[model samples]
Target: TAPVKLAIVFYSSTGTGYAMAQEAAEAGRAAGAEVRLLKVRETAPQDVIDGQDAWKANIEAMKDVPEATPADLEWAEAIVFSSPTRFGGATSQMRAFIDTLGGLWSSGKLANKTFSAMTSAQNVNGGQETTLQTLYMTAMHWGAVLTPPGYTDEVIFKSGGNPYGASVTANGQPLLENDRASIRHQVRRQVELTAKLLEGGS
Candidate 1:
């Protein structure tokens, strides 16, 4: 059988979500899935993005990440979405990208895909769970098979114990080893589940 196709779709203003997306891409590949690391286009005004040095630097650093489109989801057997939490919800940039999928949703092109999500927040208590719930809710509308991390690995407990997915506390520093491991496990599990679905003729 052909390798499962996985799309890692994300939005980042200061690179937290980008790191998670990269981790997921690596995990997907390690799980023998074909992966695409895709980023949602920044919807903030250029001046707003430029106001934050970290945001500007991150944008420049991620110049090579292809902008995601609905076609990417259509091509994927599994999808992992990542976004920074903004007031208990995903960033508007991620929402903007998801909004483009109405056509695909209506056409049933979004159905039956395995989906998972990751999120980062400025504070430990900052809306990470809610953000993951929102992403999963959107996936529900698409009829996607949700593959949440759900304490499947001890790494989840080590990394703040987010059963919904890999939720990170944003500090603009390199990701912690535990966070990386949690994300890897989530993607690996999702890819594995997708492979089984494919074999079962999803």
Candidate 2:
């Protein structure tokens, strides 16, 4: 069988989300999927600190995305969105990128595609669920199937992790070894589960 195409699109401020995205991409590749990793442009703190209005304008200007994202979206059978939690929700960059999908949505280009989100935050109980919910809502609006790393896996509850999505502790410090392991496991599960789902398995 031909490999299913998977696209990992993400925005990271302190690189935590990027790390998760990379792991997810690698896992998807290992699962016999052709994976493409996309990083949102202008993802620095300076750009996000400028506020939502600025970020929105920048997205409108097409300054924070690659010319290939829409084409990739059109081509991929699955998508994974990774973003850092910002003020209890998905980062402005992630929202901006989603907003650009209006065309895809209208054309039903993203309909029925498998999709999931991976999020990282500084606090354990601070906004990780909210961020995941926000991303899931976006995927739902586009008619994409949403998958999440559930608690069925014991590793999800072993350390600093949550079933809401791939949770990480990047508290203005380097990620702890346990936290990295938790993230890796979560993303790997996402890739495996997404592949299974795409293949008509449970």
Q: What is the alpha-carbon lDDT of model 1 when measured against the actual structure?
A: 0.93
Top candidate by TM-score? 1
lDDT of 2 at 11: 82
In the range 123-163, model 1's lDDT, one tens digit per residue, is 99899899999999999999999999999899999998999
- Per-residue CA lDDT of model 2 for 124-159, tens digit only, reads 778878888888887888888776767756767775
Clashes of each: 0, 0
lDDT winner among the candidates? 1
TM-score: model 2 vs. ground truth: 0.79
Off by over 4 Å in 1: none
